[PDB]
Every structure is written in C-alpha cells, then in structure tokens.
Design a protein around this motif. Structure first.
Motif, PDB file in Angstrom:
ATOM      1  N   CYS A   9       0.875  -1.106   0.322  1.00 41.90           N
ATOM      2  CA  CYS A   9      -0.158  -0.081  -0.069  1.00 41.90           C
ATOM      3  C   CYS A   9       0.957   1.316  -0.075  1.00 41.90           C
ATOM      4  O   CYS A   9       0.202   2.282  -0.530  1.00 41.90           O
ATOM      5  CB  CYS A   9      -1.168  -0.118   1.189  1.00 41.90           C
ATOM      6  N   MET A  10       2.125   1.122   1.056  1.00 45.27           N
ATOM      7  CA  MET A  10       2.238   2.280   1.336  1.00 45.27           C
ATOM      8  C   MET A  10       3.888   2.526  -0.775  1.00 45.27           C
ATOM      9  O   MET A  10       4.138   3.997  -0.402  1.00 45.27           O
ATOM     10  CB  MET A  10       3.294   1.775   2.336  1.00 45.27           C
ATOM     11  N   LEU A  11       3.515   1.327  -0.983  1.00 41.13           N
ATOM     12  CA  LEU A  11       4.794   1.726  -2.176  1.00 41.13           C
ATOM     13  C   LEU A  11       3.421   2.036  -3.327  1.00 41.13           C
ATOM     14  O   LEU A  11       3.901   2.628  -4.407  1.00 41.13           O
ATOM     15  CB  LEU A  11       5.393   0.096  -2.673  1.00 41.13           C
ATOM     16  N   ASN A  12       2.410   1.624  -3.176  1.00 35.30           N
ATOM     17  CA  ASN A  12       1.308   2.162  -4.174  1.00 35.30           C
ATOM     18  C   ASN A  12       1.161   3.482  -4.079  1.00 35.30           C
ATOM     19  O   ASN A  12       0.609   4.017  -5.293  1.00 35.30           O
ATOM     20  CB  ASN A  12      -0.072   1.003  -4.582  1.00 35.30           C
ATOM     21  N   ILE A  13       1.117   4.220  -2.896  1.00 35.71           N
ATOM     22  CA  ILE A  13       0.735   5.356  -2.995  1.00 35.71           C
ATOM     23  C   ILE A  13       1.998   6.629  -2.926  1.00 35.71           C
ATOM     24  O   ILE A  13       1.263   7.664  -3.551  1.00 35.71           O
ATOM     25  CB  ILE A  13      -0.062   5.873  -1.865  1.00 35.71           C
ATOM     26  N   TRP A  14       2.885   6.211  -2.425  1.00 44.09           N
ATOM     27  CA  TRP A  14       3.965   6.515  -2.895  1.00 44.09           C
ATOM     28  C   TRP A  14       4.362   6.878  -4.710  1.00 44.09           C
ATOM     29  O   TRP A  14       4.256   5.802  -4.862  1.00 44.09           O
ATOM     30  CB  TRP A  14       5.582   6.800  -2.529  1.00 44.09           C
ATOM     31  N   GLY A  15       3.763   8.085  -5.779  1.00 46.25           N
ATOM     32  CA  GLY A  15       3.708   7.546  -6.504  1.00 46.25           C
ATOM     33  C   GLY A  15       4.210   8.788  -7.980  1.00 46.25           C
ATOM     34  O   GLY A  15       5.007   8.648  -7.220  1.00 46.25           O
ATOM     35  N   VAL A  16       3.682   9.320  -8.621  1.00 44.09           N
ATOM     36  CA  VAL A  16       4.015  10.449  -9.832  1.00 44.09           C
ATOM     37  C   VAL A  16       3.780  11.256  -9.128  1.00 44.09           C
ATOM     38  O   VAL A  16       5.025  12.329  -9.204  1.00 44.09           O
ATOM     39  CB  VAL A  16       3.160   9.584 -10.930  1.00 44.09           C
ATOM     40  N   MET A  17       3.158  11.545  -8.406  1.00 38.39           N
ATOM     41  CA  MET A  17       2.803  13.387  -7.798  1.00 38.39           C
ATOM     42  C   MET A  17       3.781  13.928  -6.841  1.00 38.39           C
ATOM     43  O   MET A  17       2.998  14.426  -6.538  1.00 38.39           O
ATOM     44  CB  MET A  17       1.083  13.850  -7.998  1.00 38.39           C
ATOM     45  N   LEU A  18       5.708  12.792  -6.790  1.00 39.17           N
ATOM     46  CA  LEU A  18       5.839  13.429  -5.147  1.00 39.17           C
ATOM     47  C   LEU A  18       6.671  14.042  -5.384  1.00 39.17           C
ATOM     48  O   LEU A  18       7.130  15.143  -4.487  1.00 39.17           O
ATOM     49  CB  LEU A  18       5.578  12.083  -4.627  1.00 39.17           C
ATOM     50  N   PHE A  19       8.002  14.028  -7.009  1.00 43.14           N
ATOM     51  CA  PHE A  19       9.037  14.216  -7.135  1.00 43.14           C
ATOM     52  C   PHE A  19       8.512  15.504  -8.361  1.00 43.14           C
ATOM     53  O   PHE A  19       8.785  16.571  -8.153  1.00 43.14           O
ATOM     54  CB  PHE A  19      10.015  13.038  -7.606  1.00 43.14           C
ATOM     55  N   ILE A  20       7.827  14.770  -9.822  1.00 41.81           N
ATOM     56  CA  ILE A  20       7.724  15.595 -10.166  1.00 41.81           C
ATOM     57  C   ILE A  20       6.532  16.387  -9.976  1.00 41.81           C
ATOM     58  O   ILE A  20       6.089  17.532 -11.460  1.00 41.81           O
ATOM     59  CB  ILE A  20       7.860  14.719 -12.140  1.00 41.81           C
ATOM     60  N   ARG A  21       5.989  16.244  -9.772  1.00 38.83           N
ATOM     61  CA  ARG A  21       3.955  17.667  -9.872  1.00 38.83           C
ATOM     62  C   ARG A  21       4.044  18.156  -8.508  1.00 38.83           C
ATOM     63  O   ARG A  21       3.406  18.510  -8.507  1.00 38.83           O
ATOM     64  CB  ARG A  21       3.210  16.949 -10.060  1.00 38.83           C
ATOM     65  N   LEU A  22       4.910  18.077  -7.384  1.00 39.71           N
ATOM     66  CA  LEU A  22       4.112  18.102  -6.123  1.00 39.71           C
ATOM     67  C   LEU A  22       5.031  19.301  -5.792  1.00 39.71           C
ATOM     68  O   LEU A  22       4.502  20.485  -4.948  1.00 39.71           O
ATOM     69  CB  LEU A  22       4.826  17.416  -4.692  1.00 39.71           C
ATOM     70  N   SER A  23       5.914  20.120  -6.482  1.00 37.15           N
ATOM     71  CA  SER A  23       6.805  21.249  -6.507  1.00 37.15           C
ATOM     72  C   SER A  23       5.357  22.462  -7.160  1.00 37.15           C
ATOM     73  O   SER A  23       5.303  23.283  -6.506  1.00 37.15           O
ATOM     74  CB  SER A  23       7.730  20.970  -6.838  1.00 37.15           C
ATOM     75  N   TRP A  24       5.914  21.496  -8.362  1.00 43.03           N
ATOM     76  CA  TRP A  24       4.617  22.507  -8.831  1.00 43.03           C
ATOM     77  C   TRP A  24       3.646  22.777  -7.967  1.00 43.03           C
ATOM     78  O   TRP A  24       2.693  24.132  -7.903  1.00 43.03           O
ATOM     79  CB  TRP A  24       4.029  21.368  -9.743  1.00 43.03           C
ATOM     80  N   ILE A  25       2.757  21.902  -7.240  1.00 42.33           N
ATOM     81  CA  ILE A  25       1.385  21.787  -6.336  1.00 42.33           C
ATOM     82  C   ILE A  25       1.675  23.164  -5.298  1.00 42.33           C
ATOM     83  O   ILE A  25       0.643  23.874  -4.964  1.00 42.33           O
ATOM     84  CB  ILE A  25       0.457  20.766  -6.575  1.00 42.33           C
ATOM     85  N   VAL A  26       3.226  23.073  -5.395  1.00 38.33           N
ATOM     86  CA  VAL A  26       3.327  23.948  -3.931  1.00 38.33           C
ATOM     87  C   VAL A  26       3.737  24.927  -4.213  1.00 38.33           C
ATOM     88  O   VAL A  26       4.031  26.381  -3.768  1.00 38.33           O
ATOM     89  CB  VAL A  26       3.871  23.139  -2.749  1.00 38.33           C
ATOM     90  N   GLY A  27       4.066  25.214  -5.698  1.00 39.82           N
ATOM     91  CA  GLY A  27       4.046  26.535  -6.269  1.00 39.82           C
ATOM     92  C   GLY A  27       2.532  27.226  -6.330  1.00 39.82           C
ATOM     93  O   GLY A  27       2.969  28.133  -6.118  1.00 39.82           O
ATOM     94  N   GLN A  28       1.678  26.628  -6.965  1.00 38.41           N
ATOM     95  CA  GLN A  28       0.950  27.501  -7.428  1.00 38.41           C
ATOM     96  C   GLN A  28      -0.033  27.975  -6.039  1.00 38.41           C
ATOM     97  O   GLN A  28       0.174  29.409  -5.919  1.00 38.41           O
ATOM     98  CB  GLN A  28      -0.056  26.071  -8.242  1.00 38.41           C
ATOM     99  N   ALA A  29      -0.588  27.197  -4.907  1.00 42.46           N
ATOM    100  CA  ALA A  29      -1.485  27.351  -4.428  1.00 42.46           C
ATOM    101  C   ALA A  29      -0.143  27.882  -2.841  1.00 42.46           C
ATOM    102  O   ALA A  29      -1.086  28.119  -1.452  1.00 42.46           O
ATOM    103  CB  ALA A  29      -2.577  26.396  -4.147  1.00 42.46           C
ATOM    104  N   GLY A  30       0.609  27.780  -2.831  1.00 40.50           N
ATOM    105  CA  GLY A  30       1.345  28.166  -1.975  1.00 40.50           C
ATOM    106  C   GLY A  30       1.748  27.434  -0.880  1.00 40.50           C
ATOM    107  O   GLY A  30       1.635  26.055  -1.497  1.00 40.50           O
TER     108      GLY A  30
END
Ligand SMILES: CCCCCCCCCCCCCCCC(=O)O
Ligand SMILES: CCCCCCCCCCCCCCCC(=O)O
Ligand SMILES: CCCCCCCCCCCCCCCC(=O)O
Ligand SMILES: CCCCCCCCCCCCCCCC(=O)O
Lengths: 446, 446
Positions: A9-30
C-alpha cells in the motif's frame, strides 16, 4: 502479516505526483493552502480507509481480493457497480503513471542533446514502448513482482533521504536555479497563492488527488496473506499516516527553500526575493516552469524509476483480476467473454486494459489525465462510503474496525460535491452510469 | 367535463412570460432559436403530460387531487418527495407571478409621473400589498374564484386578439419606437442571436420555462369534476397544443415586426435597418431594453391583470392544499403541525406560503426569480417522469393514456441534464434533498 500489506500500500500511494508535480502544486497554491490540499485529500481517503477496513472485518471470506469481500458483504447491486468503476479507474491510472514516467525520461533526454521526433511526440513513443514491456512483466513474471519489492522501496526511501540530506547543503553554484537554504524571506513569500493562467484551488486539488489513492491495494489481496482480519485494518490506516506525514514534510520543505519564477544566469544584488540575486517577471530554471526540482545526487532519476513503474505495474495486474471475477459472477451478461484465461491469468482482459491505457496514453499531458483519474477514484470511494452506510441502515455486522459508524455518510458527501466541483459534466455522467448499473442489477431475474 | 379542466390549465399556463418577457426572449435569441426554446420546453412538458395522464388513468381514486392520485398509485416513497418539491415550487411561483405583476404597474406609473420611493423599491411595496389581498381572496372567497373565470379568460383572449389586430395597422407615429409591418429586411435581421452581456441559450431557456409549466392544475382537482378518467388525459394534452401554437404565433409575429435597439426621436434616412429611420448603437424605447411592447389599444394593461393575478391565485390555493394532505398522511413527522385548519381550509399553511412568497418577493428582479422557479418545476417533473418508469419496471396498471411506455425515461433525462446546465450547484442540492427524502421514507417503521 503487516509487512506484506503495508509495503504493497505504501509503495502504491507513493507514486508520480511526489517528485515531479508536488513542487508545482506547492508553487501554485503556496504552502498554507497546499497543506490544506494534503489534509482534505487525506480526510477523504481516511474515511474510505475506515470503511474498507470495516468491510474486511465481518466474515472469514478468505478467497478473492477487493471484489470477493466488497460484493459478498454488501450485495451484488453495489458490488457490480464498484467492480466496474474501480476496474476502469485502475485501467486509466496505469496510463497516468506511464505518461508521468515518460515525461521525466524525455526531459532527461532534453539534457545531453537527444531528440527523437518532437517535443511531446516522443512521449507517445516512450509510452508506447513502456506499456508493451509492462505486459511482458504482468503476463509471465509474477514471482519476481511480489518478491523483491522491498528492494523496489528502499531505493525510494533513499530517494527521499538524499533529497532531505541535499536541501541542507549550500550548493553555491545552484542558487541561480532558485535553490536556497531555509530563510524567512522565502517562507514568508511562498505562504500565499500565485495561481497561474487557469489553475484554481480545486484544479490543483484534482491534479494532486491521485497521489493519495492506492489504499485499496492492501486489501486487494486476501487469498495471499494469513489472518486477513487483523492485517487490513492496521496496514491501510498506517500507510496513510506515513504517507501524509511525508507529503507535508516534503511540501513545507520544498516550499520554504526554492523561490518561484527565478531564471539561471549571472546576476547580482547591488523587493520580492530580497537576496543576492535579482530576476525579471516576464524563466526556464524556475520553480513554477520546470517540474523536476532536485537538491543533489541525481539518483532521484532512479527514484522515479521505482515510484512510477511499480505503481503502474500494481494497477495493471489489478484491473483485469478484478474485472475477471466480476465477469465470473456473471452479473453483467454482455461482459461474459472476459472470464476465460490461460494459473487463472486473464489474457483477454489484458488486451482490454492495454487498449484503455493506450487510448488514454496518447494524450501526452499529465495535467489533463490527472483530473479524469481523480474523477473515477472519487466515484469508487463514494460508492464504498455510501454502500457501507446503506448496509448500516438496511440491516452484515461491522465488528469494529475502530470506526464503522454512520459518519461514513459524511465521507460519501465529501466524495460527491468535490467530484462535481471538478468538471461537473463528467460527474453527472458517471452518476447516471452508476445509477443505471444499480437499477439494472436490482431488477433482473436471478 | 373538458370545459372545466381545459380552462383551469390553459389559464394557468398563460402567465407572466407571455406579454412582458417573450419579446425580450425573442429579442435575445432571435426567431430561429426562440422557436427551438418553445419546442424543447414543450417536449419536456408533453412527456410529463403523458405521464401525469397515465397516473390518473388506473383507478377510481375520486378523492383528493394531484397528491392523492400520484401517491396512492406510485407509493409513499416518491409521493412524499413530489409532495414537497411541487408544494414548494408553487410557493415560489406565486412570488414570481407577483413581481411580474408589480413591475408592469411601476412601469405604468413611470408614465404620468408617479414615483413612490425609488425605481425598484416600490416593486417591494406593491408586491407587499398584493399578496396580502390575495390571501383575502384565498381564505374567504372561493365561490367567486372557481365560478366567473371564463370572464377572467375572455379578457385575455381579447388581449391576444387586439394585439394581433394591432400589428397589421400602420401606426405611422409609432415607428420611432421600433414598430413596423412585416418586411423581409426585419425578418432576415431578427433570425439570428445577439446575446447580451451575460445571457446564453440556457439562460433565456431558464427565463422562459415558467411560461409552460402549470399543466398539473388540470389534474389538481379530482374530487370536483365528474368522470376524472376521461377528462384529465385530453384537457391537459389539448391545452398544451393551444398554448404552444399561441407561443410560436406570438414569437414569430413580434420577432418579424419590431427591430431591436431603436430609440424614439426625430430621424430620417437620407446597413442594418435599411429603412426610413436611422439610429445609433451606443436606447430606451427599443425592443431589447424595454420589456413591454404593445401594438395598440392599451387594455393589454388589463390583459396583464388577468394573466398574472389569476395564475398567482391558482398557485396560492394549490400549495397548502397539497402540503396539508402531505401532512395528513404523516409521512414526515416534523411537519405534523400543518394539517389542522378552520370547510377543511388550512390557515396555518397559508402563513407558511405567505412567508415563502414574501421572502422570495423582496428580490425585485424577475430574471433572478425565474431560474429558481424553472429549477423546482423541473425537479418535480423529473420525479414524475421517473417514478412512472420505476413503477413500470417494479411491477399499477397504466391503461393507455395514449402513451405510457418507457419513453418517459427519456423525459426524465431531459428534465435532469437541462436542470444541471442551468445552475448546477442548485440542481445538485435538490437531488441530494430528493434522495435523502427517498431514503428517509423507504427505511422507516410504519
Ligand atoms: C447526485 C446525488 C447522488 C446521486 C446518486 C447516484 C446513484 C446512487 C444509487 C443509490 C440508490 C439507492 C437508494 C436506496 C434504494 C432502496 O432502498 O432499495
Ligand atoms: C430523478 C432521477 C432522474 C435521473 C435518471 C437517472 C438515469 C436512470 C437510468 C436507468 C436505466 C435503467 C435500465 C433498465 C434496463 C432493464 O431493466 O433491462
Ligand atoms: C444525478 C443523477 C440522478 C440522481 C437521482 C436522485 C434520486 C432519485 C432516485 C432515487 C433512487 C431510486 C432507485 C430505485 C432502486 C430500488 O429501490 O429498487
Ligand atoms: C452515490 C453516493 C451519493 C451520496 C448522496 C447521499 C445523499 C444524502 C442521503 C441522506 C440519507 C439520510 C437517511 C436518514 C435515516 C434516518 O434518520 O432514519
């Protein structure tokens, strides 16, 4: 045992949106609103975690997994609708986790001067040759997939470890690319939103939500682990507690360290950054224009290779092995082809999920694909959170998976109105589908 | 008898949106799309007419009206939801038909130099003193309301008659106000849309839809007319055939006769109008800026007085006399106050519908109120068109009200997606309400 259900489960929920889009999401919404995205997306899945732990609690249903236990405990009327919605959501999530694998390979081949055909037309080529060699893993090699996956997770915890061990270093030649330390001038700036040309709060929520969604993969085996009653409740609710406290610790760290909209060149100071460098507004190596931020030690490029291939393999083996048991109960008679296979492996369902992944893979933008993953995952979590309430009202004994009350109804409202705020004409269509597939099943002769 | 069920329906569906807003609707969406608004809004109510004629066909349920026959034929689960939705829709439609009565009185007192308080603050005053003297008609005088209503309809057919007999006259001193004959230059111009600052196609559809909606008032009496099986089917489906062929004949006539955006002054010719007058783009006596167009003989001002007071009186007597029978079946126990009255007249339900009308009357814009009337009328017609399908599938014998097939399902989809295109967050809320009031009724002990 917990160590074979918490890893899956922990390997399945750590996926694509952790390294390559979480910086974009914390950049948009602060920072202050992105943590609210983490908390709302983890409330809306911890109610589902309580509900799917209360499903696996009642009986000694040892056979099957994640369809044998949600159907025979809740009836074929809800069990035939969830068995199509979740088996389609896993058929499109494999296209999401492979376009996320491809756009970090083509953006690594953009360095060292390699161009195959075009800028985003080679994403289609690499996404074509990736799924056909994931079918080679899904069909033949099953002993090497279940075994030797801790080696596929320790090289992901090393990718978290060197990321945290790299953002304390100075890296004086890297500050033109936006990297700094932990100053208060950059934390106070990145605390509020600077929403881009079209993105709003629920838009970046729709982008983020597939990062907290594979929690049914722990309960997706029950004829494989011993004592499934004890394990499912605490290996699902504990992987969420690890993963949310990793998402918050990554979002606040990378938000208070790298400044948005800063290009990399030669500059000097001598009032936004208030630091030794100065840039212009009207960038390429910034924090909102490039998707891959990295502290040091570029095995993060290997940390993608175990975070996106593993979660795509776990959602390619899991859609036809649910859809096969759905077509073995023969609830929907038009689908009765998809039950005959070659060790009970459905090979003619692999072709169907290959065509669905290949259809949704040719659109080569991750920000287009992620809302229509976050649509169907909410359309299956709402049906779980409502079918458990409906069995609580039409009296199935829950036997206390630490909370099995009628607060799950509140987890079925929050999966409903938030699924309509994001693209209402695609939530209307899927609620007409899951009401027609309810009325067709309840009024048929069997 | 047909002449006491066709009058009560044809007088109720000829209402406020015939004289004072149909010119605005044919001005916004042109001629070729406004006729499509007529045809779509009459398909979506002729399927409901077929369905509510198939409801009144099955049994000899002589007592009650429009609640006794849709509940005892379709079950309390749908009958308790429609009995609240339709009884609230008639409680807000009386506020709509009285703000439409008030804004044609204050725009008649704008002529001859009369100002009470302000421009739209006197609409609240006249709407306050109108509803309190409609309660004086609703409580005491019932013999003068049912009798002497053909005199309340012949002065409406005279208002249609002198309108048609006036648009053939020349009226040479009236052509600065936009009036002309039947020229091809004005028909070819008014054929396409010139949508204003915010209005779209479904916006003007939402404005128009309460003009074709009071068709259940024919079936709202059944303990009053003799042989209710024969009359309801042909006095409902025949009032629609008269009223739609009046709406099309008025929209095409007033669209091919008066030009949009033309002010009234002294002008001459010597390429939009291509006529003897010339105006500017960046008007007061035009076709899209004033709401009341009139050919001649100003008893159209009396033709409002019988089209808006009569349809508001028929929706003030009809909401508590449905809600009383709902609170007499005691389906919803929190509402059990609203059944005791003074000749079985509910006087404590008149106070509730007076407060609802007074709440929705203080907003003094008709274009704001009409979408939230067209919301609840579609939310009751969808429940009728779906409950008849659900009784057709969970086997009530229809006995052929000329069409009682499962095409009513198609009339329950068109009442659903069009209710969501118009203000989706207000259709979501009312479908959560009518699903909660379904689940509360089906799982209670009785
Ligand atoms: C948009 C609001 C919610 C839409 C609901 C989508 C379909 C849900 C189906 C559940 C209906 C079952 C209700 C109880 C039926 C029974 O008592 O047999
Ligand atoms: C108030 C509800 C209106 C919205 C309607 C939702 C869509 C209903 C679809 C039901 C389809 C039923 C198919 C039955 C087929 C069969 O019985 O063979
Ligand atoms: C938004 C899509 C349609 C929403 C439908 C809202 C609720 C109306 C229908 C209630 C459920 C009826 C299902 C009947 C099944 C049964 O009880 O056998
Ligand atoms: C497909 C899931 C959509 C979720 C929509 C759920 C709408 C709310 C339902 C409320 C039911 C309340 C039942 C009350 C029970 C009682 O008090 O006896």
């Amino acid at each position: 045992w917990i160590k074979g259900v918490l890893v899956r489960c922990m390997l399945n929920i750590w996926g694509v949106m952790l390294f390559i889009r979480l910086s974009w999401i914390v950049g948009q919404a602060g920072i202050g609103l992105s943590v609210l995205v983490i908390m709302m997306a983890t409330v809306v899945t911890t109610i589902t975690g309580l509900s799917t732990s209360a499903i696996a609690t009642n009986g000694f249903v040892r056979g099957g997994g994640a369809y044998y236990l949600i159907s025979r405990s809740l009836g074929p009327e809800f069990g035939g609708a969830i068995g199509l919605i979740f088996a389609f959501a896993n058929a499109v999530a494999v296209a999401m986790y492979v376009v996320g694998f491809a756009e970090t390979v083509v953006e690594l081949l953009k360095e060292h001067s390699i161009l195959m055909i075009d800028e985003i037309n080679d994403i289609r080529i690499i996404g074509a040759i990736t799924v056909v060699i994931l079918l080679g893993i899904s069909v033949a090699g099953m002993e090497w997939e279940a075994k030797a996956q801790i080696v596929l997770l320790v090289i992901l915890l090393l990718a978290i470890g060197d990321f945290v061990i790299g953002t304390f270093i100075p890296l004086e030649s890297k500050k033109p690319k936006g990297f700094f330390g932990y100053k208060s001038e950059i934390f106070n700036e990145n605390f509020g939103p600077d929403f881009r040309e079209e993105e709003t709060f629920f838009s970046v929520f729709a982008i983020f939500f597939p990062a907290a969604t594979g929690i049914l993969a722990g309960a997706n085996i029950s004829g494989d682990l011993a004592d499934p009653q004890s394990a499912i409740p605490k290996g699902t609710l504990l992987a969420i507690l690890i993963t949310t406290l990793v998402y918050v610790g990554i979002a606040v760290s990378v938000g208070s360290c790298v400044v948005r909209d800063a290009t990399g060149n030669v500059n000097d100071t001598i009032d936004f950054s208030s630091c030794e460098s100065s840039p212009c507004s009207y960038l390429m190596n910034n924090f909102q224009v490039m998707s891959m931020v990295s502290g040091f030690t570029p095995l993060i490029s290997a940390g993608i290779f175990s975070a996106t291939l593993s979660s795509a393999l776990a959602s390619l083996v899991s859609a036809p092995k649910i859809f096969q048991a759905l077509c073995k109960d023969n609830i929907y008679p038009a689908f009765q082809m998809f039950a005959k296979g070659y060790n009970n492996e459905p090979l003619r369902g692999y072709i169907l999920t290959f065509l669905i992944a290949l259809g949704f893979i040719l659109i080569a933008e991750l920000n287009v694909i992620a809302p229509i993953i976050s649509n169907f995952f909410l359309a299956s979590y709402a049906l779980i959170n409502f079918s458990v309430f409906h069995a609580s009202l039409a009296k199935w004994r829950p036997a206390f998976k630490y909370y099995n009350m009628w607060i799950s109804l509140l987890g079925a409202i929050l999966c409903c109105i938030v699924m309509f705020v994001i693209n209402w004409w695609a939530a209307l269509l899927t609620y007409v589908i899951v009401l027609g597939l309810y009325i067709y099943v309840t009024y048929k002769k069997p």
